[PDB]
Design a protein around this motif. Structure first.
Motif, PDB file in Angstrom:
ATOM      1  N   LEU A  96       4.648  12.279   1.486  1.00 38.05           N
ATOM      2  CA  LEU A  96       4.490  11.199   2.468  1.00 38.05           C
ATOM      3  C   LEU A  96       4.332   9.864   1.718  1.00 38.05           C
ATOM      4  N   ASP A  97       5.325   8.994   1.839  1.00 35.50           N
ATOM      5  CA  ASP A  97       5.452   7.855   0.933  1.00 35.50           C
ATOM      6  C   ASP A  97       5.545   6.530   1.686  1.00 35.50           C
ATOM      7  N   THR A  98       4.405   5.865   1.889  1.00 30.15           N
ATOM      8  CA  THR A  98       4.389   4.617   2.652  1.00 30.15           C
ATOM      9  C   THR A  98       5.125   3.475   1.948  1.00 30.15           C
ATOM     10  N   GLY A  99       5.343   3.610   0.637  1.00 28.53           N
ATOM     11  CA  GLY A  99       6.054   2.597  -0.130  1.00 28.53           C
ATOM     12  C   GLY A  99       7.564   2.754  -0.098  1.00 28.53           C
ATOM     13  N   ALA A 100       8.043   3.806   0.565  1.00 29.56           N
ATOM     14  CA  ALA A 100       9.470   4.096   0.685  1.00 29.56           C
ATOM     15  C   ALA A 100       9.997   3.697   2.064  1.00 29.56           C
ATOM     16  N   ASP A 101      10.966   2.783   2.094  1.00 27.70           N
ATOM     17  CA  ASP A 101      11.594   2.374   3.345  1.00 27.70           C
ATOM     18  C   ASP A 101      12.316   3.548   3.987  1.00 27.70           C
ATOM     19  N   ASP A 102      12.932   4.357   3.130  1.00 26.02           N
ATOM     20  CA  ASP A 102      13.854   5.382   3.556  1.00 26.02           C
ATOM     21  C   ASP A 102      13.358   6.745   3.106  1.00 26.02           C
ATOM     22  N   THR A 103      13.931   7.779   3.715  1.00 27.87           N
ATOM     23  CA  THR A 103      13.654   9.162   3.353  1.00 27.87           C
ATOM     24  C   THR A 103      14.764   9.640   2.422  1.00 27.87           C
ATOM     25  N   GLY A 127      14.872   1.802  -6.602  1.00 28.04           N
ATOM     26  CA  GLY A 127      13.464   2.124  -6.772  1.00 28.04           C
ATOM     27  C   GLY A 127      12.904   1.433  -8.000  1.00 28.04           C
ATOM     28  N   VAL A 128      11.817   1.978  -8.536  1.00 32.16           N
ATOM     29  CA  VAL A 128      11.125   1.346  -9.656  1.00 32.16           C
ATOM     30  C   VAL A 128      12.015   1.177 -10.887  1.00 32.16           C
ATOM     31  N   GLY A 129      12.852   2.178 -11.150  1.00 30.83           N
ATOM     32  CA  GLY A 129      13.625   2.251 -12.390  1.00 30.83           C
ATOM     33  C   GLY A 129      15.053   1.748 -12.296  1.00 30.83           C
ATOM     34  N   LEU A 157       0.872  -1.166   0.000  1.00 31.20           N
ATOM     35  CA  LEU A 157       0.000   0.000   0.000  1.00 31.20           C
ATOM     36  C   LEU A 157       0.916   1.225   0.000  1.00 31.20           C
ATOM     37  N   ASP A 158       0.894   1.952  -1.111  1.00 26.85           N
ATOM     38  CA  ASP A 158       1.909   2.938  -1.402  1.00 26.85           C
ATOM     39  C   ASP A 158       1.306   4.306  -1.712  1.00 26.85           C
ATOM     40  N   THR A 159       1.342   5.194  -0.721  1.00 24.12           N
ATOM     41  CA  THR A 159       0.795   6.536  -0.891  1.00 24.12           C
ATOM     42  C   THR A 159       1.671   7.418  -1.773  1.00 24.12           C
ATOM     43  N   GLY A 160       2.905   6.980  -2.027  1.00 25.06           N
ATOM     44  CA  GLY A 160       3.811   7.694  -2.923  1.00 25.06           C
ATOM     45  C   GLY A 160       3.608   7.360  -4.392  1.00 25.06           C
ATOM     46  N   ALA A 161       2.751   6.387  -4.676  1.00 21.85           N
ATOM     47  CA  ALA A 161       2.496   5.953  -6.045  1.00 21.85           C
ATOM     48  C   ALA A 161       1.193   6.544  -6.563  1.00 21.85           C
ATOM     49  N   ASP A 162       1.256   7.295  -7.663  1.00 21.22           N
ATOM     50  CA  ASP A 162       0.055   7.877  -8.264  1.00 21.22           C
ATOM     51  C   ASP A 162      -0.928   6.776  -8.687  1.00 21.22           C
ATOM     52  N   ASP A 163      -0.407   5.733  -9.331  1.00 18.39           N
ATOM     53  CA  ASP A 163      -1.220   4.652  -9.883  1.00 18.39           C
ATOM     54  C   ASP A 163      -0.630   3.278  -9.567  1.00 18.39           C
ATOM     55  N   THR A 164      -1.518   2.313  -9.405  1.00 19.95           N
ATOM     56  CA  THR A 164      -1.178   0.919  -9.133  1.00 19.95           C
ATOM     57  C   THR A 164      -0.333   0.325 -10.259  1.00 19.95           C
ATOM     58  N   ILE A 183       6.177   5.277 -16.501  1.00 12.19           N
ATOM     59  CA  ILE A 183       6.186   5.804 -15.140  1.00 12.19           C
ATOM     60  C   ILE A 183       7.617   5.974 -14.653  1.00 12.19           C
ATOM     61  N   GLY A 184       7.804   6.965 -13.792  1.00  9.47           N
ATOM     62  CA  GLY A 184       9.124   7.307 -13.288  1.00  9.47           C
ATOM     63  C   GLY A 184       9.179   7.352 -11.772  1.00  9.47           C
ATOM     64  N   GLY A 185      10.328   6.990 -11.234  1.00 12.01           N
ATOM     65  CA  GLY A 185      10.553   7.131  -9.801  1.00 12.01           C
ATOM     66  C   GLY A 185      12.035   7.174  -9.513  1.00 12.01           C
ATOM     67  N   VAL A 186      12.397   6.646  -8.350  1.00 12.74           N
ATOM     68  CA  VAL A 186      13.781   6.541  -7.952  1.00 12.74           C
ATOM     69  C   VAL A 186      14.458   5.519  -8.864  1.00 12.74           C
ATOM     70  N   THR A 201       8.243  -3.512 -12.561  1.00 17.89           N
ATOM     71  CA  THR A 201       8.446  -3.063 -11.193  1.00 17.89           C
ATOM     72  C   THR A 201       8.961  -4.244 -10.376  1.00 17.89           C
ATOM     73  N   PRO A 202       9.881  -3.993  -9.429  1.00 16.44           N
ATOM     74  CA  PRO A 202      10.374  -5.090  -8.602  1.00 16.44           C
ATOM     75  C   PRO A 202       9.409  -5.536  -7.491  1.00 16.44           C
ATOM     76  N   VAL A 203       8.354  -4.759  -7.259  1.00 26.03           N
ATOM     77  CA  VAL A 203       7.355  -5.060  -6.239  1.00 26.03           C
ATOM     78  C   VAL A 203       5.968  -4.670  -6.733  1.00 26.03           C
ATOM     79  N   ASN A 204       4.957  -5.398  -6.266  1.00 25.37           N
ATOM     80  CA  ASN A 204       3.573  -5.062  -6.600  1.00 25.37           C
ATOM     81  C   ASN A 204       3.147  -3.875  -5.754  1.00 25.37           C
ATOM     82  N   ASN A 221      11.217  14.886  -3.330  1.00 26.95           N
ATOM     83  CA  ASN A 221      11.526  14.673  -1.914  1.00 26.95           C
ATOM     84  C   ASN A 221      10.524  13.700  -1.314  1.00 26.95           C
ATOM     85  N   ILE A 222      11.036  12.621  -0.725  1.00 24.53           N
ATOM     86  CA  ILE A 222      10.220  11.527  -0.216  1.00 24.53           C
ATOM     87  C   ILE A 222      10.462  11.334   1.274  1.00 24.53           C
ATOM     88  N   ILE A 223       9.388  11.370   2.066  1.00 24.39           N
ATOM     89  CA  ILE A 223       9.422  10.991   3.485  1.00 24.39           C
ATOM     90  C   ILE A 223       8.991   9.526   3.574  1.00 24.39           C
TER      91      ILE A 223
HETATM   92  C1  LIG Z   1       9.362   7.590  -5.875  1.00 21.37           C
HETATM   93  C2  LIG Z   1       7.849   7.788  -5.821  1.00 21.37           C
HETATM   94  C3  LIG Z   1       7.503   9.229  -6.195  1.00 21.37           C
HETATM   95  C4  LIG Z   1       7.111   6.824  -6.750  1.00 21.37           C
HETATM   96  N1  LIG Z   1       7.394   5.405  -6.503  1.00 21.37           N
HETATM   97  C5  LIG Z   1       6.651   4.855  -5.350  1.00 21.37           C
HETATM   98  C6  LIG Z   1       7.568   4.622  -4.151  1.00 21.37           C
HETATM   99  O1  LIG Z   1       6.817   4.312  -2.959  1.00 21.37           O
HETATM  100  C7  LIG Z   1       8.546   3.478  -4.404  1.00 21.37           C
HETATM  101  C8  LIG Z   1       7.861   2.117  -4.452  1.00 21.37           C
HETATM  102  C9  LIG Z   1       8.889   1.028  -4.625  1.00 21.37           C
HETATM  103  C10 LIG Z   1       9.313   0.294  -3.524  1.00 21.37           C
HETATM  104  C11 LIG Z   1      10.265  -0.707  -3.660  1.00 21.37           C
HETATM  105  C12 LIG Z   1      10.793  -0.998  -4.917  1.00 21.37           C
HETATM  106  C13 LIG Z   1      10.359  -0.276  -6.027  1.00 21.37           C
HETATM  107  C14 LIG Z   1       9.404   0.732  -5.889  1.00 21.37           C
HETATM  108  N2  LIG Z   1       9.505   3.405  -3.326  1.00 21.37           N
HETATM  109  C15 LIG Z   1      10.796   3.688  -3.448  1.00 21.37           C
HETATM  110  O2  LIG Z   1      11.346   4.127  -4.446  1.00 21.37           O
HETATM  111  O3  LIG Z   1      11.563   3.415  -2.249  1.00 21.37           O
HETATM  112  C16 LIG Z   1      12.927   3.825  -2.316  1.00 21.37           C
HETATM  113  C17 LIG Z   1      12.996   5.327  -2.147  1.00 21.37           C
HETATM  114  C18 LIG Z   1      13.301   5.540  -0.669  1.00 21.37           C
HETATM  115  O4  LIG Z   1      13.272   4.248  -0.068  1.00 21.37           O
HETATM  116  C19 LIG Z   1      13.572   3.265  -1.061  1.00 21.37           C
HETATM  117  S1  LIG Z   1       7.413   4.494  -7.863  1.00 21.37           S
HETATM  118  O5  LIG Z   1       7.502   3.104  -7.524  1.00 21.37           O
HETATM  119  O6  LIG Z   1       8.542   4.956  -8.596  1.00 21.37           O
HETATM  120  C20 LIG Z   1       6.058   4.668  -8.740  1.00 21.37           C
HETATM  121  C21 LIG Z   1       5.876   5.732  -9.619  1.00 21.37           C
HETATM  122  C22 LIG Z   1       4.685   5.882 -10.339  1.00 21.37           C
HETATM  123  C23 LIG Z   1       3.652   4.956 -10.167  1.00 21.37           C
HETATM  124  N3  LIG Z   1       2.499   5.068 -10.881  1.00 21.37           N
HETATM  125  C24 LIG Z   1       3.837   3.874  -9.315  1.00 21.37           C
HETATM  126  C25 LIG Z   1       5.027   3.737  -8.606  1.00 21.37           C
END
Ligand SMILES: CC(C)CN(C[C@@H](O)[C@H](Cc1ccccc1)NC(=O)O[C@H]1CCOC1)S(=O)(=O)c1ccc(N)cc1
Ligand SMILES: CC(C)CN(C[C@@H](O)[C@H](Cc1ccccc1)NC(=O)O[C@H]1CCOC1)S(=O)(=O)c1ccc(N)cc1
Lengths: 99, 99
Positions: free
Chosen positions: B24-31, B49-51, A24-31, A47-50, A80-83, B83-85
């Motif tokens: 505020l990012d519940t899917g992020a382990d770290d800040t 992360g995702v990418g 359950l990921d509040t940082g993700a715009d879409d599933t 989609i883009g992230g870290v 994605t490495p995680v659902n 910036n991710i919490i």
């Molecule tokens: C970075 C945020 C803004 C967006 N991501 C969500 C985040 O929760 C992301 C979820 C995740 C967890 C573990 C492995 C891979 C991804 N966690 C994350 O990167 O954890 C890192 C940063 C600090 O701690 C570790 S996303 O996956 O890129 C993403 C983007 C767009 C959509 N539609 C769906 C997902």
């Protein structure tokens, strides 16, 4: 339920008849779910992230059961490495962040 | 507060004498925060992360204020697009997910 954040907020979901574990990921715009087959039409999206971006398949109006809550909405599928359950479906279960 | 998830849950944080917008990012382990010239001792690390993976500076025991809540913990600094919490500080402000 109330979910604390000492551990990853993992729940069981059902999609396409199959049970999976998802964040359950509040940082993700879409599933976005790990590579899988899903019936129906889709279109490509980025989609883009870290770490940067991935290319995904966007399926609209897909039923998902999340911890016994039935939702219907956009599910992205790709490498994605995680659902991940994102805000689009968290809003449908009536999920809020509280502190 | 009780925060709905229609829009990204962005809040104001205070870190290193700067006011910043963070997710505020519940899917992020770290800040992890966008690159900034923060003083103090740090160690180089990688996070995924995702990418894929990025190199970050790991700063320990950094004071951060999130919505009036004064906490202290590990902050990563690097080429994150936002910036991710993450959970390490969400637990400290007493944040839970509720549905
Ligand atoms: C970075 C945020 C803004 C967006 N991501 C969500 C985040 O929760 C992301 C979820 C995740 C967890 C573990 C492995 C891979 C991804 N966690 C994350 O990167 O954890 C890192 C940063 C600090 O701690 C570790 S996303 O996956 O890129 C993403 C983007 C767009 C959509 N539609 C769906 C997902
Ligand atoms: C590591 C990358 C960002 C490349 N570096 C640039 C450096 O300014 C880099 C920028 C940075 C700041 C804050 C967080 C992360 C990165 N500073 C730094 O403190 O990063 C450490 C922390 C974690 O890992 C390396 S580089 O290797 O030095 C380099 C220099 C010149 C060339 N042409 C190619 C590479």
């Amino acid at each position: 339920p109330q979910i604390t954040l000492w551990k990853r907020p993992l729940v069981t979901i059902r999609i396409g008849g199959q049970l999976k574990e998802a964040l359950l990921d509040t940082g993700a715009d879409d599933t976005v779910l790990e590579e899988m087959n899903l019936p129906g039409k889709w279109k490509p999206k980025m989609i883009g992230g870290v770490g940067g971006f991935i290319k995904v398949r966007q399926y609209d109006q897909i039923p998902i059961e999340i911890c016994g809550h039935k939702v219907i909405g956009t599910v992205l599928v790709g490498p994605t490495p995680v659902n991940i359950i994102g805000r689009n479906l968290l809003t449908q279960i009536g999920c809020t962040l509280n502190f």
